[PDB]
């Protein structure tokens, strides 16, 4: 049951992080307006967040956690300590080099990133200052996520999940209180993320002390563990760049599209990355350490059981979510984005991109389940091979769909790209005789889909009772929003309960 | 040795993702509007 408890804890903590995130820019825009200073900090803060995809989130984790599990299971806790100290030191050196690079080349990075900031002299001078202040955040979040990764390997998931929203509270305090202490006050926000990064790191040392994994970052290039981490980081960086290329060409097609389409894709992606980030990302952080421990220990039957449990729970929590987002594509857009600058036209286009993205919503989450399967096997080359294959085929459906579907085609093609990426993941797993699903899958699907028709029948029935959503103000429109969905999911879980489905069937130990 | 170029290439991709997309968008823009009627 602790596997469900950990998954619920991470998903709930991420839920807290996102709602704190929405409050973050709401107050920031309220107190700092929406001038050239506000988006200057946004650019200076998003840049370390993309570098997080390399050193903290999307490249370092799958290249380090599987090695950590093998070291812990076989060699012992002493060899694990010397290994983690060496890799942490090498990681600190890598982050220090790039951080120092940004220190003496902050103006160069600004013009490289945003050409629209160099022409504005007063914004260029401002953004260079903030970028200098918030650059060490990538250093702090690199160790913060490094400690979060090892804690996850030791079955501590609540503590790392608190770190993201913890930075939100630190930033909320700096903006609310230390506004007049800086001239201009925007530098307070720049210091806020830096202080948040330190506060994130210092948070987990008391927990790291409990397991005795605290280590000074010693340096040894010749050490085998560090060399292996870098060796596997090779394909990991290749996968990150491959996904980056796919994102780049998606932007190329979007730019060629009709004017104003980029905003619709941005908002649809916001409403699409919200559930996949809460569900799929959280599922990755729990499965990856657990699968790696089972594979390293030689418990292949537990590796298959964990893979099956992650797969069935993914279907259980993603299929209703995808259909619900598709059904409420209209209500969601008109209750979150149809305010002043939006009309009925813009909300309609966002709803069409929402249903197209929600088709692949199941694909995005299940990819976050299948990808740790090969990441667990210390075979990162295969996911990249699927990634490039998906990349090339994504473009040929992109140029096929832009014709008759325009922005809806781009969103739908991304959705099918993730879904077929997952089927490629499934095919490779079965072809190499690795994952053997437990019997009873067919009954699981048929009982799941009929619950989805319960979701739709209740939701469209409640929608037609619910009068026009444009009526009312902010609090009234939002209040009716979760009100319908909580009754819908309650009906969904009631349908699951009367269908012979119980929580104990999804309870996993260790 | 080859690892460094891979790290630098992907760092460039993340840091300059908007600018490379913008750079090629009007670079191949004359190429694509001439492709429309062909």
* Facing residue for B17 by CB, picked from A115, A248, A256: A248
Q: Which residue has the tokens 């991109």?
A: A353
Best residue of A237, A243, A265 to probe chain B, by most B CBs closer than 10 Å? A237
Round to whole Å and give the CA distance between A7 and A460.
Answer: 30
* Facing residue for A113 by CB, picked from B16, B25, B28: B16
> CA-based diameter of chain B, in Å?
47
| Chain A residues touching B13 at Cβ < 8 A | 241, 244-245, 248
* Helices and strands in chain B, H and E counts: 3, 0
PDB experimental method: cryo-EM
CB pairs under 8 A between A and B: 67
Residue B32 forms contact with A (CB below 8 Å): yes
Residue B7 forms contact with A (CB below 8 Å): yes
Helix A224-256 to helix A77-104 angle, to the nearest 10 degrees?
A: 50
* Facing residue for B6 by CB, picked from A51, A112, A237: A237
Domain ranges of chain B: 2-33
Which are the contacts of A31, defined by CB distance < 8 A and separation ≥ 6? A175, A176, A179
Nearest to A88 by CA among A240, A199, A223, A281: A223
Question: What region does A218 belong to: left with phi over 0, alpha with psi -120 to 50, or beta?
Answer: beta
Round to whole Å and give the CA distance between A205 and A163.
Answer: 12
> Helix, strand or coil for residue A509?
coil
Whether the CB-CB separation of A12 and A5 falls below 8 Å is answered with no
Whether the CB-CB separation of A507 and A4 falls below 8 Å is answered with yes
* Facing residue for A112 by CB, picked from B2, B15, B32: B15
Round to whole Å and give the CA distance between A358 and A418.
Answer: 11
Helix B17-25 to helix A224-256 angle, to the nearest 10 degrees?
A: 40
Nearest to A323 by CA among A491, A453, A422, A480: A453
A206 burial level (CB within 10 Å; 0-12, 13-18, 19+) = exposed
Give the Cβ contact number of residue A103 at 10 Å.
Answer: 12
Sign, Cα dihedral of B9, B14, B20, B21:
positive
And the tokens for A128? 């260079």
Question: What region does A439 belong to: left with phi over 0, alpha with psi -120 to 50, or beta?
Answer: beta
Cβ separation of B6 and A247 shorter than 8 Å? no
- Header resolution in angstroms: 3.0
| Helix/strand/coil (H/E/C) assignment for every residue in A391-442 | HHHHHHHHHHHHHHHCHHHHHHHHHHHHHHHHHHHHHHHHHCCCCCCCCCHH
And the tokens for A60? 């370092």
Which helix (H) or strand (E) segment holds residue A114: the answer is none
Cβ separation of B9 and A241 shorter than 8 Å? yes
Q: Pseudo-torsion of CA A350, A354, A355, A358, nearest 10°?
A: 170
| Chain B residues touching A240 at Cβ < 8 A | 10, 14
Cβ separation of B17 and A244 shorter than 8 Å? yes
| φ and ψ of A500, to 5 deg | 85, 10
Instruction: State the Cα angle at A439 between A435 and A440, rounded to 5°.
Output: 125
| Chain B residues touching A97 at Cβ < 8 A | none
Round to whole Å and give the CA distance between A412 and A401.
Answer: 8
Residue B8 forms contact with A (CB below 8 Å): no
| Chain B residues touching A402 at Cβ < 8 A | none
And the tokens for A176? 């609310």
Round to whole Å and give the CA distance between A408 and A27.
Answer: 33
And the tokens for A18? 């996102």
Round to whole Å and give the CA distance between A77 and A155.
Answer: 15
| Helix/strand/coil (H/E/C) assignment for every residue in A292-346 | HHHHHHCCHHHHHHHHHHHHHHHHHHHHHHHHHHHHCHHHHHHHHCCCCCCCHHH
CA A381 to chain centre: 22
Round to whole Å and give the CA distance between A148 and A146.
Answer: 5
Round to whole Å and give the CA distance between A380 and A60.
Answer: 12
Round to whole Å and give the CA distance between A150 and A64.
Answer: 9
| Chain A residues touching B22 at Cβ < 8 A | 115, 255
Cis peptide before A297 (omega within 30 of 0): no
Cβ separation of B10 and A237 shorter than 8 Å? yes
Round to whole Å and give the CA distance between A114 and A127.
Answer: 10
Whether the CB-CB separation of A167 and A15 falls below 8 Å is answered with no
In order, the DSSP letters of A60-94 are HHHHHHHHHHHIIIII-HHHHHHHHHHHHHHHHHH
| Chain B residues touching A246 at Cβ < 8 A | none
Sign, Cα dihedral of B21, B23, B25, B28:
negative
A205 burial level (CB within 10 Å; 0-12, 13-18, 19+) = exposed
Whether the CB-CB separation of A16 and A106 falls below 8 Å is answered with no
Question: What region does A435 belong to: left with phi over 0, alpha with psi -120 to 50, or beta?
Answer: beta
Give CB contacts under 8 A, 24+ apart, made by B26-29: B28/A252, B29/A256
Give CB contacts under 8 A, 24+ apart, made by A426-435: A426/A370, A428/A374, A428/A382, A428/A386, A429/A307, A429/A370, A429/A373, A429/A374, A434/A373, A434/A377, A435/A303, A435/A304, A435/A307, A435/A308, A435/A373
Give CB contacts under 8 A, 24+ apart, made by A390-398: A390/A246, A390/A417, A390/A420, A390/A421, A390/A424, A391/A242, A391/A245, A391/A246, A393/A417, A393/A420, A394/A246, A394/A249, A395/A249, A398/A249, A398/A250, A398/A253
* Facing residue for A251 by CB, picked from B10, B21, B32: B21
Round to whole Å and give the CA distance between A488 and A416.
Answer: 27
Nearest to A17 by CA among A282, A345, A374: A282
Q: Which residue has the tokens 């980030």?
A: A277
Distances (CA, A) of A90 to A29, A261, A353: 39, 43, 43
In order, the DSSP letters of A462-499 are HHHHS--TTSS-HHHHHHHHHHHHHHHHHHHHHHHHHT
And the tokens for A307? 């893979």
Give the Cβ contact number of residue A110 at 10 Å.
Answer: 25
Residue B34 forms contact with A (CB below 8 Å): no
Round to whole Å and give the CA distance between A221 and A256.
Answer: 47
Residue B29 forms contact with A (CB below 8 Å): yes
- Cβ-based interface (< 8 Å): residues of A facing B: 47, 50-51, 53-54, 59, 98, 109, 112-115, 230, 233-234, 237-238, 240-241, 244-245, 247-248, 251-252, 255-256
Whether the CB-CB separation of B12 and A244 falls below 8 Å is answered with no
Whether the CB-CB separation of A75 and A297 falls below 8 Å is answered with no
Domain ranges of chain A: 1-220, 250-510
Which are the contacts of A400, defined by CB distance < 8 A and separation ≥ 6? A409, A413
Distances (CA, A) of A282 to A11, A21, A133, A218, A397: 6, 17, 30, 31, 30
> CA-based diameter of chain A, in Å?
69
Whether the CB-CB separation of A207 and A161 falls below 8 Å is answered with no
Residue B16 forms contact with A (CB below 8 Å): yes
| Helix/strand/coil (H/E/C) assignment for every residue in A229-269 | HHHHHHHHHHHHHHHHHHHHHHHHHHHHCCCCHHHHHHHHH
Helix A344-359 to helix A407-431 angle, to the nearest 10 degrees?
A: 10
First to last CA, chain B: 45
Round to whole Å and give the CA distance between A361 and A370.
Answer: 14
Cβ separation of A255 and B21 shorter than 8 Å? yes
Q: How far is A454 from chain B (nearest CA, A)?
A: 43
Alpha helices per DSSP H over A114-223: 115-118, 121-134, 136-153, 158-177, 186-210
Cβ separation of B10 and A54 shorter than 8 Å? yes
Q: How far is B7 from chain A (nearest CA, A)?
A: 6
And the tokens for A251? 């932007």
**Minimum Cα–Cα distance from B36: chain A residue:** A403
Cβ separation of A230 and B29 shorter than 8 Å? no
Nearest to A378 by CA among A59, A53, A70, A52: A70
Residues for chain A: how many in total?
Answer: 510
Which are the contacts of A450, defined by CB distance < 8 A and separation ≥ 6? A495, A499
| Helix/strand/coil (H/E/C) assignment for every residue in A348-396 | HHHHHHHHHHHHCHHHHHHHHHHHHHHHHCCCCHHHHHHHHHHHHHHHH
Give CB contacts under 8 A, 24+ apart, made by A54-57: A54/A237, A54/A240, A54/B7, A54/B10, A54/B11, A54/B14, A55/A91, A55/A94, A55/A95, A55/A138, A55/A142, A55/A145, A56/A138, A56/A141, A56/A142, A56/A144, A56/A145, A56/A146, A57/A145
């Amino acid at each position: 049951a602790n596997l469900l408890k950990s998954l619920a804890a991470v998903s709930s903590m991420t839920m807290f992080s996102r709602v704190l995130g929405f409050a973050r820019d709401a107050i920031v825009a309220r107190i700092f307006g929406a001038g050239m200073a506000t988006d200057a900090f946004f650019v200076a803060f998003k840049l370390p967040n993309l570098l997080r995809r390399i050193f903290a989130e999307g490249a370092f984790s799958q290249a380090f956690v599987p090695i950590l599990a093998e070291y812990k299971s076989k060699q012992g806790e002493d060899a694990t300590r010397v290994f983690v100290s060496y890799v942490s030191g090498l990681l600190t050196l890598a982050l220090a080099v790039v951080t120092v690079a940004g220190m003496l080349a902050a103006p160069w990075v600004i013009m490289v990133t945003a050409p629209g900031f160099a022409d504005t002299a007063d914004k260029f001078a401002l953004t260079s200052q903030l970028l200098k202040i918030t650059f060490p955040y990538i250093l702090l979040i690199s160790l913060a996520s490094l400690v979060g990764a090892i804690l996850n390997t030791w079955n501590r998931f609540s503590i790392p999940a608190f770190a993201p929203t913890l930075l939100n509270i630190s930033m909320i305090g700096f903006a609310l209180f230390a506004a007049p202490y800086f001239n201009p006050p925007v530098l307070a926000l720049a210091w806020a993320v830096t202080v948040g990064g330190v506060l994130q790191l210092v948070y987990q040392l008391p927990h790291l002390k409990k397991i005795g994994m605290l280590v000074l970052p010693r340096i040894n290039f010749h050490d085998a563990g560090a060399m292996r981490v870098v060796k596997q980081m090779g394909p990991a960086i290749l996968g990150v760049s491959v996904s980056q290329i796919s994102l780049i060409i998606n932007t190329i097609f979007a730019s060629f599209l009709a004017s104003g389409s980029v905003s619709w894709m941005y908002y649809a992606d916001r409403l699409m990355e919200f559930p996949s980030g809460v569900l799929g990302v959280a599922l990755g952080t729990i499965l990856l350490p657990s699968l790696s421990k089972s594979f390293a220990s030689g418990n292949h039957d537990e590796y298959n059981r964990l893979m099956d449990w992650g797969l069935r729970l993914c279907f259980l929590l993603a299929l209703p979510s995808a259909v619900a987002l598709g059904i409420l594509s209209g209500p969601l857009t008109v209750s979150l984005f149809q305010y002043g600058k939006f009309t009925a036209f813009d909300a309609l286009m966002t709803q069409r991109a929402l249903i197209a993205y929600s088709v692949g919503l199941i694909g995005l989450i299940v990819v976050k389940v299948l990808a740790p399967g090969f990441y667990s096997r210390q075979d990162i080359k295969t996911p990249v091979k699927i990634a490039i294959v998906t990349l090339i085929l994504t473009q040929l459906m992109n140029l096929a769909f832009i014709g008759p579907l325009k922005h809806a085609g781009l969103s739908l093609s991304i959705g099918l790209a993730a879904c077929l990426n997952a089927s490629l993941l499934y095919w490779q797993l079965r072809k190499q005789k690795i994952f053997t699903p437990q019997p009873g899958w067919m009954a699981f699907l048929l009982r799941l889909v009929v619950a989805v028709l319960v979701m739709s029948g209740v939701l469209l029935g409640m929608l037609h009772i619910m009068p026009e959503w444009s009526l009312g103000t902010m609090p009234w429109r939002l209040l009716r929003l979760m009100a319908v969905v909580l009754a819908g999911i309650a009906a969904y879980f009631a349908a699951l309960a009367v269908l012979g489905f119980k929580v104990k069937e999804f309870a996993r130990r260790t | 040795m080859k690892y460094i170029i891979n790290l630098a290439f992907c760092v460039l991709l993340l840091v300059a993702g908007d600018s490379i997309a913008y750079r090629v968008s009007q670079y191949l823009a004359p190429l694509v509007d001439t492709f429309t009627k062909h």
